[PDB]
Enzyme design. Structure first.
Site, PDB file in Angstrom:
ATOM      1  N   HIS A   1     -49.579   4.530  12.565  1.00 11.53           N
ATOM      2  CA  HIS A   1     -50.413   5.281  11.602  1.00 11.53           C
ATOM      3  C   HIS A   1     -49.918   5.257  10.150  1.00 11.53           C
ATOM      4  O   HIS A   1     -50.628   5.718   9.267  1.00 11.53           O
ATOM      5  CB  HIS A   1     -50.644   6.732  12.077  1.00 11.53           C
ATOM      6  CG  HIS A   1     -49.400   7.426  12.495  1.00 11.53           C
ATOM      7  ND1 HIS A   1     -48.929   7.390  13.789  1.00 11.53           N
ATOM      8  CD2 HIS A   1     -48.500   8.143  11.787  1.00 11.53           C
ATOM      9  CE1 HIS A   1     -47.788   8.055  13.865  1.00 11.53           C
ATOM     10  NE2 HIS A   1     -47.511   8.533  12.665  1.00 11.53           N
TER      11      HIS A   1
ATOM     12  N   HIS B   1     -45.799   9.832   0.237  1.00 10.32           N
ATOM     13  CA  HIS B   1     -45.268  11.147   0.581  1.00 10.32           C
ATOM     14  C   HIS B   1     -43.801  11.076   0.888  1.00 10.32           C
ATOM     15  O   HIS B   1     -43.401  10.245   1.716  1.00 10.32           O
ATOM     16  CB  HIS B   1     -46.010  11.687   1.797  1.00 10.32           C
ATOM     17  CG  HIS B   1     -47.436  11.981   1.524  1.00 10.32           C
ATOM     18  ND1 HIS B   1     -48.370  12.106   2.518  1.00 10.32           N
ATOM     19  CD2 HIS B   1     -48.108  12.138   0.359  1.00 10.32           C
ATOM     20  CE1 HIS B   1     -49.555  12.344   1.989  1.00 10.32           C
ATOM     21  NE2 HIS B   1     -49.420  12.377   0.677  1.00 10.32           N
TER      22      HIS B   1
ATOM     23  N   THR C   1     -50.461  16.693   7.297  1.00 17.08           N
ATOM     24  CA  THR C   1     -51.772  16.041   7.290  1.00 17.08           C
ATOM     25  C   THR C   1     -52.059  15.237   8.548  1.00 17.08           C
ATOM     26  O   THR C   1     -53.098  14.559   8.623  1.00 17.08           O
ATOM     27  CB  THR C   1     -51.957  15.104   6.086  1.00 17.08           C
ATOM     28  OG1 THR C   1     -51.121  13.934   6.216  1.00 17.08           O
ATOM     29  CG2 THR C   1     -51.675  15.847   4.783  1.00 17.08           C
ATOM     30  N   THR C   2     -51.129  15.285   9.503  1.00 18.90           N
ATOM     31  CA  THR C   2     -51.322  14.729  10.814  1.00 18.90           C
ATOM     32  C   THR C   2     -50.807  15.774  11.775  1.00 18.90           C
ATOM     33  O   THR C   2     -50.064  16.665  11.347  1.00 18.90           O
ATOM     34  CB  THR C   2     -50.539  13.405  11.036  1.00 18.90           C
ATOM     35  OG1 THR C   2     -49.152  13.666  11.257  1.00 18.90           O
ATOM     36  CG2 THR C   2     -50.708  12.427   9.847  1.00 18.90           C
TER      37      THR C   2
ATOM     38  N   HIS D   1     -49.953   6.118   2.583  1.00 17.74           N
ATOM     39  CA  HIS D   1     -51.336   6.175   3.010  1.00 17.74           C
ATOM     40  C   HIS D   1     -52.138   5.289   2.080  1.00 17.74           C
ATOM     41  O   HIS D   1     -51.935   5.325   0.867  1.00 17.74           O
ATOM     42  CB  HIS D   1     -51.893   7.592   2.936  1.00 17.74           C
ATOM     43  CG  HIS D   1     -51.133   8.589   3.745  1.00 17.74           C
ATOM     44  ND1 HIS D   1     -51.475   8.909   5.037  1.00 17.74           N
ATOM     45  CD2 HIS D   1     -50.066   9.363   3.434  1.00 17.74           C
ATOM     46  CE1 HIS D   1     -50.642   9.824   5.496  1.00 17.74           C
ATOM     47  NE2 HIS D   1     -49.783  10.118   4.538  1.00 17.74           N
TER      48      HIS D   1
END
Ligand SMILES: Cc1ccc(-n2cc(-c3ccc(S(N)(=O)=O)s3)nn2)cc1
Ligand SMILES: [Zn+2]
Length: 251
Positions: free
Chosen positions: A60, A111, A192-193, A88
């Protein structure tokens, strides 16, 4: 869990359905000027080449594991240690930042995840007020090859396969972030996950980081994720502020 489909994230972790999630859409006119927000301070980010660091395609994102001794402060008495950084991004001609500014999505986002010095481990900090802090910067296209990013991006071919990793020499980790540590937005939100734990202090820099077109293409076109899918568009949709007020360090 995955981006794009099942399992529903709230089934994975109830905290993914909290009222106060990240990322968010930053509307600078609605941000509150808060002059207590001083310039961020980093210590120990200029690493020697040895020992090497682990860079991993986890399906991811691409994540660089950071060594001990990277200290970050949000202000006097607000002290943290860096754990890891990751990215991301979008896809050919499509932006993939997590945060947006007035609806604008930027090509990519970094991040840098930190743990409060009050906690020995991440698992103890999850869901605690200010237990984790993330520094976030947007990546945009500039004319030059970014040499700090090239050290990571030149190694993505080695980790194209989901779940692969490689070792990279230490570098100046602060060179992956903007030089302006004075101007930023800050708010409280979540991971955020999954597990999407709340109590996370998010700091989003005003100034952006510049990568070449070639670099941005390498980021989005090299890695593979779950199934036989390209690892792309690995961002969560923006979440409502739901009454939170974003603070800005400048009027
Ligand atoms: C035992 C354990 C170890 C690590 C984690 N961690 C989870 C995470 C993160 C999930 C999402 C992010 S992110 N996209 O920066 O908000 S950081 N970072 N560490 C959670 C539990
Ligand atoms: Zn992230």
């Amino acid at each position: 869990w995955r981006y794009g489909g099942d399992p529903p994230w709230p089934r994975v972790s109830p905290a993914c359905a909290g009222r106060f999630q990240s990322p968010v859409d930053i509307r600078p006119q609605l941000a509150a000027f808060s002059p207590a927000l001083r310039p961020l301070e980093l210590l120990g980010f200029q690493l020697p080449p040895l020992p090497e660091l682990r860079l991993r395609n986890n399906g991811h994102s691409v994540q660089l594991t950071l060594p001990p001794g990277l200290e970050m402060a949000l202000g006097p008495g607000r002290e943290y240690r860096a754990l890891q950084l990751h990215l991301h991004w979008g896809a050919a001609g499509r932006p993939g930042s997590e945060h947006t500014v007035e609806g604008h999505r930027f090509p990519a986002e970094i991040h840098v995840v930190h743990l409060s010095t009050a906690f020995a481990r991440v698992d103890e900090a999850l869901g605690r007020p200010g237990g984790l802090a993330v520094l976030a910067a947007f990546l945009e296209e500039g004319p030059e090859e970014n040499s700090a990013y090239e050290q990571l991006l030149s190694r993505l071919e080695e980790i194209a396969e989901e779940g692969s990793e490689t070792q990279v020499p230490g570098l100046d980790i602060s060179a992956l972030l903007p030089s302006d540590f004075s101007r930023y937005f800050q708010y409280e939100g979540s991971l955020t996950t999954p597990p999407c734990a709340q109590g996370v202090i998010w700091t989003v820099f005003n100034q952006t980081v510049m990568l070449s077109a070639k670099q941005l293409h390498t980021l989005s076109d090299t890695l593979w994720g779950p199934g036989d899918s390209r690892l792309q568009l690995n961002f969560r949709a923006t979440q409502p502020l739901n009454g939170r007020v974003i603070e800005a360090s400048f009027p």
